[PDB]
UniProtKB/Swiss-Prot annotation, chains A, B, C, D:
One of its GO terms (cellular component) is viral procapsid. It comes from Salmonella phage P22 (Bacteriophage P22). The gene is 5. The lineage of its organism: Viruses, Duplodnaviria, Heunggongvirae, Uroviricota, Caudoviricetes. InterPro entries: Phage_coat_Gp5. This is Major capsid protein. The keyword Protein transport does not apply.
């Protein structure tokens, strides 16, 4: 063994996590600007931009400056980690030793997938439902991919390669067989609410800056917005809803689509308020500036006494899809000091294939005549753009 | 001239801003570890010095586990700009040229002194009052300086480097003449409210973190407490209030002092909620864990049906004082790429004592036969330790 | 950094205790004859000032044989500590590091002042009290400082190095301005007791030793007499009492003074026994040997049917004073463990003027990826002569 | 340690006794002339002189050289002692060792102060009485320092070198604030006698010599005098009296004063005789030589049927004053042999600022496993001019 141990451990971890994390790829990396950070925590804003049709002419005098930018938050929790004791018969030879560290790495890598897979099904906003099972038979059985293509094309929203679809394993066989399996995809559940309405007519705006209590200006996160209700019994986060008169618009030409608008609920507050996504910015109001109108998705105001209806009417396992760069993974080197305290050999490491970073450490314990071993990965994940994440269901 | 222009421009800017900034010289200089970049600002967090219960004897066991830590916000937008043309008659020779840059730099740097003065006078929490005018050697007169040490020393808030005091120039002569005069100091104003009452018993804790909408954990700054009242009837930010029947505690010794507890209001919400400072943690509340009780400030919880009184019934010019480290100036070097683009010139400067970073840049214009110049300074200030910024209302 | 940490840390702890511990500095340093040893708690005895009868003549025969000697106990408890984990960002660089050692050292320093200040003000036996509040230059107000020489000089309890005085900050302002501020002093509180009376005739004498359970002889500290009364309620420790018709004597001259004798109560037992200070060795008790009578200080035996009265009927912030040598702080160096266990670092240290001693230690802990630090002080403090600590109670 | 002990002992004793002897150092230091007066006990005569106005004119045979000079006696009693055993822990090192000697020296100094103060107060012959307490009010109290200049200046006794006053510490406070304060001054006490009378006509002379039993000539102790009175009960040493009729004269001009002649009683003999002071040498007697008449004090003989009245009818702590050179302290080197005996160590020392002499001796032991120490001071004190020592009393 000869004190080499850390080299074999990082060799297993890097190789293993790169192999077994398929759904953590197919999403886009990001970083701090200079890796300089050292505090216990930090908060990052990051930008998003809506594309614009190309100007034609020999030379130009207009629209070079662009339009109003927006930003979204991300925040990093305490690391996911594994913590275990090396009894010496696991340490006796290399091809035995790899077993332990590999099993820990596999136990850890599960959580990196489970977090993103759970997040997409709860937080997403496009919804498709047919009162049918999935099947290959052209008659009297439904096809999921056919509608999931059409609903994005008709919005103008997907304009790039890599649009991806995911199945749960007990459905992946029903459809025969870019498409992938995941075992980790959750179950929704049936909400109990009925007769729900808004009260008082309401409207909303994109905004770049507002005041903080000290008197400075901050960007305001634009993903969700508040709506107020006649009642709020019988609902939970990750449910799915629609407003009776309301329809979506395509991003470029701004025609109305055929089908009704869809919204997704992220918190319930004080028996009175709900936070929902995406923010329902409306066409056909004179109040908006020519910049502000460019972010309208919705045909009307949220009018008084609008009937609110549940779409998730009976419950089953999910299936999920997204356009490229809807979900991001963020990380830093861990704040730690090397070659300072004698009682704790430790090293940093990175996983370039997935953008994670982590730390390995070990210490000898008098209470068990054995080494203790710890591994931790620091990472944060969020949807940047709820408008682009979609969920299908088998019937109700 | 030689093309030397920048060597005169920075000489004027560094010297003139050094001479005209009497108040900003006495906040604490600071730096974050980051290097933020123009399209995405960072809401960088910072810590406050911690406290803990007494812990006694040999064989101490796991008693580190409960220890608690706290933080406060600071925020930054785009920098302040000044931006103007160099006509040719402003550009003949050194003694003519200087004037221009001095006029710009004065117009810029004045904004910083106005910020720190106006923020302190609005936001601070210690209040001192006399019906008398400021004066000396006379029982009809009142002395500011004595009370302005005594009220703060008896709280145990003072450090080793000592306090500082700012008078307005209308009052200053009446006291004759650590102590300075500043022209920029605002008037508070009178407020109409009366018959105000607390609406129901309220209580508070220090807090480590709360949940983000995405499901992560974020630190929460404990500076601002929400309080709910009968109708707020025309209160304003920067006003000053006291509740009946509650008293301050000495920070280390925990004994009660004699005089009424005092609070400052920073924002108003929905006619029945207000944001106030500092957070009123009680000593008599059974409900705190002992590691939380270490932060106590007030003799009782803010009990039901306590009357408010308003400490600002008639108005006069302010005078202001603070303990050391109660105000910070935050700044970062400006990102620009030296000699990346040929068709422009830029250079970087950093004012050594007040700690403001700054950028100078110049450009030609074929459309007007004239050079453009653009100077910018990036900075932000925040009320750390709001428990130790204080304001005096003479002549009330 | 280089793991040199101790050579900075002690050079902050020494200095940052030294500047802020006045009530410790004015106590008098002592030493036992030993060099101290760690594991066991460890009472130590020491002698008071002696007295002996007059003895004229060229011839003395055996008259040294009867000389009577007295001692008192100090009783060192288990140690005083502060104990916390070094986040790593607090260890980046020297000027950022110092602040953490200061933040710990201030909490450590505060506990020493609070001990001696509370002990003196609670236990002490001279009472000065007035129906008026403190003031100056005014016939209808009272000055504390004169009476707090007059009582001591009248007893001839004075000493070469001179007495010393403290005020709380709320009173110190009213005295204008050997004399010191302090934030730390306690509040006494009102006692409900009334009609208290002595249950049977009693008197007292000094004793050198008494029999232990095993049949050996051990010393008795003479300070704490015990008295038995009609039933008592609400006499919490730190209260103050006097007996009708009993007067003090000057220590050397044995002349009777004019004012009432005063006593301070330290525990309650069985609702009908109390412990009180000083032990009232009566002159004109016919039972004493002349070698005992030399310690007498009170005009009569404690006769039957004596009326007690209570000396603190309304409660306000106190203040405190003492003769030289009245308070002793005891400490000595702790044993070192240099390199004895390989997985640890430590050193002893001392604070040369105030006389305290302590130990610094640090450890790397894999449970939190952090260095732990422990700093510990070992000190005991006691009133060596309770006749010489005096307390003010204005406004009765 | 190291046998140096005697050096540290005198370094404590010389210092501390010189600091705590405020009264004794106002008496006049005096010595017999010889360097070798080794006899184990002795009585020492000293001459007294009365001042005479400087003469005028070119040559003199008016009175010239031959005069009726007078002597007084002082008798040196046994030394004062202090005598104690050195346990082992009192002899560890210098900073501990100094405490024992310092405490013994203090204890020793107390006798010297108490002796002179008690002697002056009980023996003195001017008396002032007012039926009041001491205080600064205009027409409501008594002003002691006025009367005790008026009474002496009107006798013309203290014409040169001035005077000294002492107050008890309780009266000094009421007088506000040449003048000093001491705890040690005694209480007189009330006496029972009434209706007393002179028993038969008596008169007196100054004298230089009378015959001893063996027909040699000796001086006559010319301060005391004997009177016979009707049978006495309840007279005691140090009482105060005045006869009917008789009035005092000023020394330098023989004018009568208004107030009564006054006297002090030193010893009762057989219930029929008393010794009193000063000796009442009358003017207006023919039985006097022209030199003898110069010493006269009073306006008539002490005739038959003169009534006695008591000037001490109710009692309090005294106050006292004297003209300079009217109390003397006498001392000599102690007779002892050095290195004559090998078993015992001793050395001799002086206290220059008081004129006292003393001896230090230390002796080994077998009886108690210890060292013995014995320090002794030899001195005697007397009212060498009792006409000049005055006493004041508050009312009756």
């Amino acid at each position: 063994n000869e004190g080499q141990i850390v080299t074999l451990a990082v060799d297993e971890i890097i190789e293993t996590i790169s192999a077994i994390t398929p759904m953590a790829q197919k999403a886009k990396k990001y970083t701090p600007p200079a890796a300089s950070m050292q505090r216990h925590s930090n908060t990052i804003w990051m930008p998003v931009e809506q594309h614009s049709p190309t100007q034609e002419g020999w030379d130009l005098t207009d629209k070079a400056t662009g339009l109003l930018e927006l930003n979204v938050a991300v925040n990093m929790g305490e690391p996911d980690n594994d913590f275990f004791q090396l009894r010496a018969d696991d340490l006796r030879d290399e091809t035995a030793y790899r077993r332990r560290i590999q099993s820990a790495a596999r136990k850890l890598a599960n959580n990196v997938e489970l977090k993103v897979a759970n997040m997409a099904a709860e937080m997403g906003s496009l919804v498709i439902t047919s009162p049918d099972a999935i099947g290959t038979n052209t008659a009297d059985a439904w096809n999921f991919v056919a509608d999931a293509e059409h609903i994005m094309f008709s919005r103008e929203l997907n304009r790039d390669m890599g649009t991806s679809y995911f199945f749960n394993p007990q459905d992946y066989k029903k459809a025969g067989y870019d498409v992938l399996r995941s075992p980790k995809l959750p179950v929704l559940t049936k909400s109990t609410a009925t007769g729900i309405t808004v009260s008082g007519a309401q409207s909303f705006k994109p905004v770049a800056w507002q005041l903080d209590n000290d008197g400075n200006k901050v960007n305001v996160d634009n993903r969700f917005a508040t709506v107020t209700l006649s009642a709020t019994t019988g609902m939970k986060r990750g449910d799915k809803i629609s407003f009776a008169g309301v329809k979506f618009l395509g991003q470029m030409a701004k025609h109305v689509l055929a089908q009704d608008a869809t919204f997704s609920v992220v918190r319930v507050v004080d028996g009175t308020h709900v936070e929902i996504t995406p923010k329902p910015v409306a066409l056909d109001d004179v109040s908006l500036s020519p910049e502000q109108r460019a972010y309208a998705n919705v045909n009307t105001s949220l009018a008084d006494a609008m009937a609110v209806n549940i779409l998730n009417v009976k419950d089953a396992r999910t299936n999920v899809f997204w356009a490229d760069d809807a979900i991001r993974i963020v990380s830093q080197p861990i704040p730690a000091n090397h070659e300072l305290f004698a009682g704790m050999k430790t090293t940093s490491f990175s996983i370039p294939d997935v953008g994670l970073n982590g730390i390995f450490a070990t210490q000898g314990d008098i209470s068990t005549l054995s080494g203790l071993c710890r591994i931790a990965l620091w990472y944060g994940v969020n949807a940047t753009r709820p408008e682009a994440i979609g969920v299908g269901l088998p019937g109700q």
